[PDB]
Amino acid sequence: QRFLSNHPRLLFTGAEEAAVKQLIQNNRLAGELAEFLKAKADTLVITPQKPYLKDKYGNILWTSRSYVNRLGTLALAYRLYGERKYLDAANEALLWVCNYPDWDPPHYLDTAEMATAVAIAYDWLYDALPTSTKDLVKKCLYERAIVRVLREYEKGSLGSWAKRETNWNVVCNTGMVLAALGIAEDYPKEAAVILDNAAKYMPNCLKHFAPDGVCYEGPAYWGYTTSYLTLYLKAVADNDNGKGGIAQLPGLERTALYQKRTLTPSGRLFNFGNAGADAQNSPAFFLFSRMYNQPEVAEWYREKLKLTMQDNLLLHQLFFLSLPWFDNASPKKVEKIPALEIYHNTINDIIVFNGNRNKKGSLFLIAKGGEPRQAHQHLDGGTFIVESNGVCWTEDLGADDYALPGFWDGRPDGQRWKYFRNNNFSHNTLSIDHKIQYANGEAFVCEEHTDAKQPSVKLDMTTLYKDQASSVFRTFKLLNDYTIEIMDEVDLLSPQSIVSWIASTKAQVEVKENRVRLTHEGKHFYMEIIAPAGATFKTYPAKNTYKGEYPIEGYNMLEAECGLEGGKGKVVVRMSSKRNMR
Ligand SMILES: [Mg+2]
Ligand SMILES: [Mg+2]
């Protein structure tokens, strides 16, 4: 029988309740989280139902997501505390959304998330709801979810929301699996068919996590994909013996680690292209930490939970699962974050350096390859963010305004690259003869030495400088806990060409000959150009140029304009939290 015999069988089982109640009693953070979620439930009890109302885009997705949060939080509070105001509020919400004319299947994410919300509450309140509500909910799940997805599996093309390569596949198949399992005792044959088709089609999306767990589309996209993926993984682990092998797909084991490990210690996101912080507190992290035995991720997510509660941050629609999924594990003292690791991806390789995290002033550095012709990308191959003492000493200026004239004209001669934020002049990489990178090139990791005493990695950037250089290689080397060396090897096509080493910063800048001192809130960082001999740093403010740009304020640029003997040589810059890098 391919489901647990009794409700609740979805995400937080009956058998799991005893241990969760003990955590709430015995673990302060879990206890604080329980009280926090109970208080959220308290206001949800007295919050109006949402009218069926499409947004400017023609869908109700925001409303479905609202009900995921409302129904999950209310039903959790009823299971943990037994106060019938939580049950009755969930009953009212269930009847309300079942009396919607539809769950807007023309934009099927709407149906996927509404079915998820409804299935969870139905399952979690099964013995505690009026029979008339259970009858109506079962019929709505059957007609609006199970019947539709069975048709979609049989008739849908590869472009179908159940089969395409985008995260719609994961979200929709997940919502359908949860709906099917929620009413499985009444539709067991349908639930088995849906389980098998979900496992068949979901790899069309999830194969793109291979090999190392990188989500090219960025953290918001990752957060939506994996919040629903973890519901699926947990549900089929609990109900179907893990059949279908989704959990073992290459890259999935490492994907939460990627998200945690690519933040600076102070929490700053590598905001390249149009990436931005919005996905923070999805409970997916606790499923990954438990299923793949990564206490490092659990410990990091608990810190995020504390901050979410302390600063009253916005909640992921599935945030309520953080409590039943609570993972109290921590890494052992002996376990260390590697000094250097690389996350390979077909579009942009990601490089991550860590000096000894237990030594104050040690360096964190993250850098990227990339393909600038891809959507939303910048001419930023080789750029890096370095952090020490809680300060990001180099920057990424983020995306500019999507409304700008020619913002999408991404051809090599296109208007997109005239904007500072889009081109390499704002990024921490090379400009030859004060020109932009070639938009149709790429930078990628071509050599790695992650186990050396001074670990290093080499990027091939040649094709980003196609008309200017016959080869361009950038090597990052961690010389010690406090010091990174960047070696650019450039074979110029013209021996008089100038190689500009550029970096952006929000720190105060003092330059003198081949040295830079950066200052921020009394903390310092240092840079020294050691090759070619006699090179000089200058500095100047970044500024706006074209009307309609997001304001560019508080950014300073560093630039070393370097000639190379015979047009062939090296630019070598050492960077350290200590002034002496001899
Ligand atoms: Mg950028
Ligand atoms: Mg590669």
Residue numbers in the entry: 12 to 593
List sentences quoted exactly from the publication behind this structure.
Here we show that components of a (PUL) from Bacteroides caccae have activities consistent with comprising a unique pathway for depolymerization of chondroitin sulfate, a common GAG. After prior desulfation by an endo-sulfatase, BcSulf, to produce unsulfated chondroitin from chondroitin sulfate, the depolymerization pathway begins with the activity of a polysaccharide lyase from family 35, BcPL35. BcPL35 activity is coupled with BcGH88, an exo-β-uronyl hydrolase, and presumably BcGH109, a confirmed α/β-N-acetylgalactosaminidase. The most unique feature of the pathway is a β-D-glucuronate dehydratase, BcGDH, which we show through structural and functional analyses primes saturated non-reducing end β-D-glucuronate residues for hydrolysis by BcGH88.
BcPL35 crystallized in the spacegroup P212121 and we solved its structure to a resolution of 1.75 Å . The overall fold is a bi-domain structure of a (α/α)6 toroid fused to an anti-parallel β-sheet domain, thus generally similar to that of other PL families 8, 12, 15, 17, 21, 23, and 39 (37). The interface of the two domains is characterized by a deep groove that contains the putative catalytic machinery. The groove architecture of the active site that spans the full protein suggests endo-recognition of the substrate, which is consistent with the production of oligos with a degree of polymerization from two to six. The closest structural homologs of BcPL35 are GAGase II and GAGase VII, which are endo-acting PL35 enzymes from Spirosoma fluviale and Bacteroides intestinalis DSM 17393, respectively. The relatively high RMSD values appear to reflect that BcPL35 adopts a conformation with more widely separated N- and C-terminal domains. If the domains are separately overlapped with the respective domains in either GAGase II or VI the RMSD values drop to ∼1 Å, more accurately reflecting the high structural identity of the proteins. This did suggest, however, that there may be flexibility between the domains of BcPL35, which we interrogated by normal mode analysis using El Nemo. The primary predicted mode of flexibility involved a hinge motion at the separation between the domains resulting in ∼10 Å of movement between the domains with the crystal structure approximating an intermediate conformation. An analysis of conserved residues in the putative BcPL35 active site cleft allowed us to select six highly conserved residues for mutation to alanine: R76, E228, Y232, H387, Y413, and W419. Using cCH as a substrate, the activity for the R76 A, E228 A, H387 A, and Y413 A mutants was below detectable levels.
